[PDB]
């Protein structure tokens, strides 16, 4: 990645063995549960495009998802080239070339070129752009791998309300990778899919309900 050193200057640093193992392990243990998207973003702090490709390439399993991710990246690269086409011409001594979609994805760029763009003034943040594309791809995968549709999450008769609600928002989180209205379905389906004795209690609560007040009522 690119970090600030003890002097003000920004220098490249080797990807650490600790970070690489952490990413490989969280995928092995948690797969594509929604919380993996945060973890990737934190583990890829300051990453060059090469580093991001390294993290993704070190994943051994889940090769269907990885192939799907490549499709999303390629889709995003084409839109980059369409909105920011490369101005062609001979390059002036000591000036950098313009990054293409494939340069941002680390396929046609060198580490030194990636460092050049990221540390320029003004900076061309090829690392941050690529990370955005990867996260868009991962969101789709998390959603595909959501095991249950929200409509099928219904409280068991012996299930504590807290455990049903935990399951409910986890499923909601997996669909559309959170980042949605999160309000229309809640005011509706959470009560309808509640258990029968609890449903009567939730119905009786009236308009306006905090999550906190309803869970206390059903304790």
């Amino acid at each position, epitope marked *: 990645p690119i970090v600030q050193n003890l002097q003000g200057q920004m220098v490249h640093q080797c990807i650490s063995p600790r970070t690489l193992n952490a990413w490989v392990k969280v995928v092995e243990e948690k797969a594509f549960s929604p919380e993996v998207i945060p973890m990737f973003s934190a583990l890829s702090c300051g990453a060059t495009p090469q580093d991001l490709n390294t993290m993704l390439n070190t994943v051994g399993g889940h090769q269907a998802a990885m192939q799907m991710l490549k499709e999303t990246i390629n889709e995003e690269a084409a839109e980059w080239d369409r909105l920011h086409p490369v101005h062609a011409g001979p390059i002036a001594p000591g000036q950098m070339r313009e990054p293409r979609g494939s340069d941002i994805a680390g396929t046609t760029s060198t580490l030194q070129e990636q460092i050049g763009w990221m540390t320029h003034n003004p900076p061309i943040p090829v690392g941050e752009i690529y990370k955005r594309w990867i996260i868009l791809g991962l969101n789709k995968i998390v959603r595909m791998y959501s095991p249950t549709s929200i409509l099928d999450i219904r409280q068991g008769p012996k299930e504590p309300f807290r455990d049903y609600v935990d399951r409910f928002y986890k499923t909601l989180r997996a669909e559309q990778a959170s980042q949605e209205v999160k309000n229309a379905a809640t005011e509706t389906l959470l009560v309808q899919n509640a258990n029968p*004795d609890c449903k*009567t*209690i939730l*119905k*009786a*609560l*009236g*308009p*306006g309900a*905090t999550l*906190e*007040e309803m869970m*206390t*009522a*059903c*304790q």
Partner: nanobody
Amino acid sequence: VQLQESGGGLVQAGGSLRLSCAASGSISRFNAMGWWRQAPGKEREFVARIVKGFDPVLADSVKGRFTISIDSAENTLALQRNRLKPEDTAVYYCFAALDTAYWGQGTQVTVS
């Protein structure tokens, strides 16, 4: 453990009144209590709520004007109706919630 509604009667417009609901055992043992009403024709409407540890919430058509309090000593829910209007006429049922919803028997309330 049984439930009993109580406290209804007849009052004039602009007056004040306090409804009360008797419960067997202690009312502080319940995890939620509150008030509903049903008027002839109009659909059953929610009146008052008190959730344990939280401040009391009352429905919006009455929220600014009424106050609700609870004394576990009398096993009663004291919905205080201030600034009373004719529209409060309905049969009123109170409910209290303890991990089994419970209802009262109701009271007819007529304000005029």
